[PDB]
Design a protein around this ligand. Structure first.
Ligand SMILES: Nc1ncnc2c1ncn2[C@@H]1O[C@H](COP(=O)(O)OP(=O)(O)OP(=O)(O)O)[C@@H](O)[C@H]1O
Ligand SMILES: Nc1ncnc2c1ncn2[C@@H]1O[C@H](COP(=O)(O)OP(=O)(O)OP(=O)(O)O)[C@@H](O)[C@H]1O
Ligand SMILES: Nc1ncnc2c1ncn2[C@@H]1O[C@H](COP(=O)(O)OP(=O)(O)OP(=O)(O)O)[C@@H](O)[C@H]1O
Lengths: 539, 107
């Protein structure tokens, strides 16, 4: 009796493979690939369907492709897979690459010819498949060796003769360069995408990578995984594995004295522990992601924090909260916009960054003009296009565009500016993203009239005003919050300024105070007043 | 500490001897890195090159704990001529953006 030897090893447990955050992808792969080989063969023969012989995996670096491939190779009860490490098949002579490819499908052919339908399963793994296979005719100058390899591969996977007992797996990082004729159904059907995880996936990974430590009581009692899951934002699996190793190394480093002449290991290795301080240090010093925006940017954009010197500082934030709530909840207006306005030295960028921070959205990015110094027009256009494209991929996103008047080069003489960048902005502000996704755009500028004159202010849904310090009470409140002057001096300052109206931006006040402090203690207040008197006003 | 970047403009009528005073101030600062970005070394350069050379001089100054950079004849740097008027816009934008870029934290 030709017993239907299961293609699944008897001792196989999903938890054994130790993959986290990829339940749906694995479910789909298992359904569309290995479903036909597990059910009793009589029904399948009645249906008359032939099995699938292809899988393709792609995604950004460090998401877990090779792990899936290795685990799948280990799961099946079949012969050892044949693995190709990049372009191992190219050779100098003529007609040796094609032979090297043909040598891979020998056992499959012979076994199919001998045993017919009742045959084992043969697996072949391709790694970095974009090194050998490419669009036919794109390359030129290789002497014709990168144009027959693809033809041989195509003729072999599915040709006049028919095989039914192979499974080819491919991995790549640039899915757009592979040949089109190699992706049609019947050759490489199941195309999957492996992407960054969400909070639950990160928690699963962090639980998978600490089970061994937790088992042996080497992990302290104050380590809470939820906080780490929340704090590590935009991390990909590889980074989440690296952080734990960094913490472990910093924990082990406390028992080695290497400054002395000879390395010596103390015998307090017993009672070892890993404390939360190690995790915080590892987060703050060693590992840093490579996607999205991080603390290194919000540190620079908001340099001196936010202080409540009056009423407007709350009004602006409340309006931002209302706008973000509207963006998140509603469904009939996927795209929203807003404009921030005010006189120079008012603090527009800080408020925009604060609102973006408090939005709490998954994806945040900032497009400032100081990262493209010396660029021509086309470079600016392409950079903006790339940022917005990366913004489209996610579910709901927020983007900030600061200093519009210098993103397009404006100078009153003339006037002069770039038409291309203006057209790019005017077209990008009226493009809705793919269905089921939401986008918020904030913009900052210091000259409303020019924008009105160019007919760009009609593309913004609404505008928000950013006022400026106007009364002595607000100035006294600002001074008391900053607390650089003493009460005795503050009495004279109030006695003087309160009998007048002031007009001075917040950012200018810090510079004025810093300039004032340089003088001697006895002449400070006077100097400060003088500077204020020279500032003037023009409401 | 609050303000890591400060700047100042020396101005006056012609033939008054102002670049010498700026050089003296820079020399008496006693800072480690002191460099003079002058148009004497940009004869025949197009706009792209002026912009890139300015950027390099301003990048070399981000790798020292203290610095002082002198710009000379802002008028000649823009190629300004009273007729028209006519000048370069890319260089002006570079300058206007390069006077507000704070250095890496701690310098
Ligand atoms: N889902 C996951 N669960 C557990 N560990 C993971 C996971 N994803 C990644 N890792 C860790 O990170 C490594 C990811 O390396 P992998 O070979 O999968 O990367 P890759 O996507 O092929 O990268 P490359 O772009 O360099 O080709 C795994 O070996 C494991 O160390
Ligand atoms: N209430 C506040 N709102 C905004 N910024 C504040 C406030 N209090 C203090 N600041 C500080 O003021 C500075 C804000 O300067 P910012 O870069 O926003 O200026 P700006 O108005 O965009 O300038 P410019 O008009 O020159 O383009 C930051 O240091 C911020 O920390
Ligand atoms: N007290 C002083 N201040 C300035 N320059 C002085 C003084 N005493 C002597 N000099 C000399 O005067 C000359 C100053 O010329 P400088 O190069 O400063 O001209 P400038 O004002 O920059 O010229 P221009 O406006 O035509 O470009 C130098 O020789 C300097 O040595």
């Amino acid at each position: 009796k030709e017993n239907r030897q299961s293609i699944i090893n008897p001792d196989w447990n999903f938890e054994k493979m130790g993959i986290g955050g990829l339940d749906k992808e694995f479910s789909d792969i298992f359904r569309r690939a290995f479903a036909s080989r597990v059910f009793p063969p009589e029904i399948v023969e009645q249906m008359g369907c032939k099995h699938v012989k292809g899988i393709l995996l792609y995604g950004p670096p460090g998401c877990g492709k090779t792990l899936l491939a290795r685990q799948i190779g280990k799961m099946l009860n079949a012969r050892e897979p044949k693995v190709v490490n990049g372009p191992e098949i190219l050779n100098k002579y003529v007609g040796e690459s094609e032979a090297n490819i043909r040598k891979l499908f020998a056992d499959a052919e012979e076994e199919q010819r001998r045993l017919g339908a009742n045959s084992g399963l043969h697996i072949i793994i391709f790694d970095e498949i974009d090194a050998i296979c490419k669009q036919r005719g794109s390359m030129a100058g290789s002497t014709g060796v990168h144009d027959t390899v693809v033809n041989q591969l195509l003729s072999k996977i599915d040709g006049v003769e028919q095989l039914n007992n192979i499974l080819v797996i491919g991995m790549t990082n640039r899915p757009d360069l592979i040949d089109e004729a190699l992706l049609r159904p019947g050759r490489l059907e199941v195309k999957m995408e492996i992407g960054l995880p969400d909070e639950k996936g990160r928690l699963q990974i962090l639980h998978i990578h600490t089970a061994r430590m937790r088992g042996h009581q080497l992990l302290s009692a104050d380590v809470d995984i939820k906080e780490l899951a929340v704090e590590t934002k935009n991390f990909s699996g590889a980074e989440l594995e690296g952080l734990v190793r960094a913490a472990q190394s910093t924990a082990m480093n406390r028992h080695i004295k290497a400054s002395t002449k000879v390395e010596v290991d103390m015998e307090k290795a017993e009672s070892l522990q890993v404390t939360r301080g190690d995790f915080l240090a590892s987060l703050e010093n060693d590992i840093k992601p490579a996607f999205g925006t991080n603390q290194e940017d919000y540190a620079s954009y908001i340099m001196n924090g936010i202080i409540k010197w009056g009423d407007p500082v709350t009004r602006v934030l409340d309006d931002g909260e209302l706008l973000v709530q509207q963006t998140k909840n509603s469904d009939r207006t996927p795209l929203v916009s807003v404009l921030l306005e005010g006189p120079p030295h008012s603090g527009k960028t800080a408020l925009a960054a604060k609102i973006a921070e408090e939005s709490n959205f998954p994806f945040i990015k900032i497009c400032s003009p100081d990262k493209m110094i010396g660029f021509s027009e086309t470079a600016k256009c392409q950079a903006m296009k790339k940022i917005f494209d990366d913004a489209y991929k996610s579910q709901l996103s927020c983007v900030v565009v600061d200093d519009i008047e210098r993103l397009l080069d404006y100078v009153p003489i003339g006037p002069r500016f770039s038409n291309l960048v203006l057209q790019a902005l005017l077209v990008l502000l009226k493009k809705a993203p793919p269905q089921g996704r939401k986008l918020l755009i904030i913009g900052t500028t210091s000259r409303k009239d020019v924008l009105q004159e160019m007919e760009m202010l009609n593309a913004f849904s609404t505008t928000i005003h950013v006022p400026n310090i106007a009364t002595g009470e607000q100035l006294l409140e600002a001074l008391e919050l900053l607390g650089n002057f003493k009460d005795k001096e503050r009495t004279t300052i109030a006695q003087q300024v309160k009998g007048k109206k002031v007009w001075i931006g917040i950012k200018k006040l810090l510079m004025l105070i810093e300039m004032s402090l340089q003088m001697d203690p006895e002449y400070r207040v006077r100097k400060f007043l003088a500077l204020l008197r020279e500032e003037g006003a023009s409401p």
